Amino acid sequence: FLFYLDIFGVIVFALSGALMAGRYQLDPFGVVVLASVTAVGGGTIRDVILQTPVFWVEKPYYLYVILATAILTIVLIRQPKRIPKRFLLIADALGLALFAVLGTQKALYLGAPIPVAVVLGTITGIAGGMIRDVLCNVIPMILREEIYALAAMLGGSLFIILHGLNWNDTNAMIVSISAALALRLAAIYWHVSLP
Amino acid sequence: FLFYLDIFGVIVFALSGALMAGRYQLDPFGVVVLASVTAVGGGTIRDVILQTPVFWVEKPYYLYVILATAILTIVLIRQPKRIPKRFLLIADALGLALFAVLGTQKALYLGAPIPVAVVLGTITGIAGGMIRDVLCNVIPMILREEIYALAAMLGGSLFIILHGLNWNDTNAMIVSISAALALRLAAIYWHVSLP
Amino acid sequence: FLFYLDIFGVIVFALSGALMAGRYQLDPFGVVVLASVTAVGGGTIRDVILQTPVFWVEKPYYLYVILATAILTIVLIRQPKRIPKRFLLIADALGLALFAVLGTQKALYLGAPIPVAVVLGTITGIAGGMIRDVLCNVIPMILREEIYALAAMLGGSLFIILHGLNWNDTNAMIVSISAALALRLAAIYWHVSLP
C-alpha cells in the first residue's frame, strides 16, 4: 500500500515538473531536471531534517520512476506550451495531498512529535512545488488566492486525529488524503479563496 | 539566558515573515508558512550542516512560538499592507544580530573550527531572510546598498575574539549581539552604504 | 590529484559568484557571500544527502580558498559591471564539469548506487549556479537554450562506464571531466542548442 502511494506521489510530482518545463520549450534534459526537482524536493528535505536516509538514495527505483514519467511526458504530449493550466494544478494537487499525509505518517513512526510530524508533512507536500515555481520565476502556490497550504495542514492533522482514535494507518491515510485532495480540487475547480 | 535568546530570535524572524505576508494580503495559513520559513530557515541549515538534531524537531515548543507570533501578527494589526518598511527591516535586524552570534556559539561548542563556526553563524542570520525574499520575488538583503552581511560576520567574529580573551559566553554574546545590531540599525536609520 | 581538483573547482565556482556580484556593484562582503554560495552550494547538498561530513566543515581550508578567490576578484579587476558574459559562462562551465565527475566519484566510493551517484554528481555541478541565479533574479542555466545539464549527466555517466571498464580513477575522471567540459564550452562558443 505504502509502496504504491509513494510511487504515485512521485510520478505525479514528476509529471507537474515535466509539464512546467514543456511551457518553456525546454529540451528533454531540462525536463528531467525540473521533473526530478519537484518529485524529490519535499521528500529530501523531510528525510534530511529527520536524520534518516533519503528515500531515492535508499531506494534507487524512484529515480527510474522519475525518468520514466519525464520521458513519457515528452513523447506522449505533442504541444506542451498550450497545455491548460488546470492539468498542472491537478497534478500538484495530487502530490500535495499524498505527501502531506505520507510525510506526517513517516515522521510520526520515526519518533517525531505530533506538531513536528505535521510540519514535516506540509513541507513534503509544498516544498517541491515551491522550488519548481522559483526556478521558473513564477509566483509560488502559497502566494496565490486559492486555498493551498490549508489542504496540506488538514491532511497531516487529520491523520494524527484518526491515529489517536486508534484507526489503522490504511484507513487513517485514505481519509486524510481524500479530505486534503477534496479541499484543494474544490479550490481549483471553483477558485475558492480565503480572506 | 540562551533559552530566552533563542525564543526571542524565533519570534522576531517569525514576525518579519508574518508582516511580509501581510503586504500580499495573504490568508492566515499563508502567513504561518512564510513566518515559519523565516523563523527556522537559518537554524535548520545550521543544524543539518552540523549533523545535529534540528532545534524545532528536538524542541517542538519553537513551533508553538512561531504559530503564536504569526497569529498575534494577524489579529493585533489592522491593515498590514500599509505597514512601514522600517518595521520589517528592524525585525530582520534583530534576528540577524541574534542568530549570527548564537549560531557561531552553538557551532563552536559542537566542535566546529573557528572559520566554520563564523560561517555557520552568518548562515543562521541571513538564510531565513533570503528564502523569504526569493519566495516573494523581492531583491534579497545582500543585494541592497545598506550594510547587511558585514553586521552578521561582525557578530560571529567578535564572539570568537571575546571567547579567545577568556570572556564567559554571557558577556561575549551580549557585546557581540549589540555590536552587530548597532551596525545594522545605523545602516537602516541613516541608510549607510558601502562602496 | 583529488586535492587539487577540489580546490580548482572551488576557486572556479567562487570566481563565477564573485563576478556575478560585480555586475551589481556590490560591496566586498556581498561579493564574498555570493561567491561562497556558488562555491559550496552543490557540495553541501551532496554531502548532506550522503549523510557525510560537509567538505568545508571537515576541511576549513576551503573557506580560506573561497575568501582568497573573492578578494582577488575584487582587487585585480577594475570595472566588473562591464565584464563580458563569456567569462561568467566559462567559469560556471569549469566547475560544472569538475564537480559533476567528482560528485559522482565521491558518492560511488561512499556506497551510493550507480544512478544515485550520477544524480548526486549533477546536483554538485548545477545546484551552486541555480542558487546564484535565483538570488540575482536571473534565469537559471537549465532554462536557457544552450546545452547545460546534458554536459553534467555526461561527465558522471562516463565516469561510471570507464570505472566499469576497470580504468583507474585518475584516467576515468580526466576523460570524464574533459568530455563534459568540451560539450559545454562548445555550446558556449558556438551557442549550440537542443530542440
Author numbering:
A (entry chain A), B (entry chain A), C (entry chain A): 4 to 198
What do the study authors state?
As evidenced by the fact that their genetic ablation led to compromised K+ permeability and Ca2+ release across the SR/ER membrane, TRICs play important roles as counter-ion channels for balancing the charge potential change during Ca2+ release/uptake in the intracellular stores.
The final model for CpTRIC was refined to Rwork/Rfree values of 24.0%/27.5%, containing ordered residues 3–198, 5 Cd2+ ions and 27 water molecules. Overall, the two prokaryotic TRICs are very similar, with a root mean squared deviation (r.m.s.d.) of 1.39 Å when 188 Cα atoms are superimposed. Another ion-binding site was also observed at an inter-protomer interface in the trimeric channel of CpTRIC. One Cd2+ ion was bound to a well-conserved Asp residues (D40 in CpTRIC, located at the N-terminal end of the GGG-kinked TM2), and interacting with several backbone carbonyl oxygen or nitrogen from the short linker between TM5′ and TM6′ on the adjacent protomer (residues 145–149 in CpTRIC).
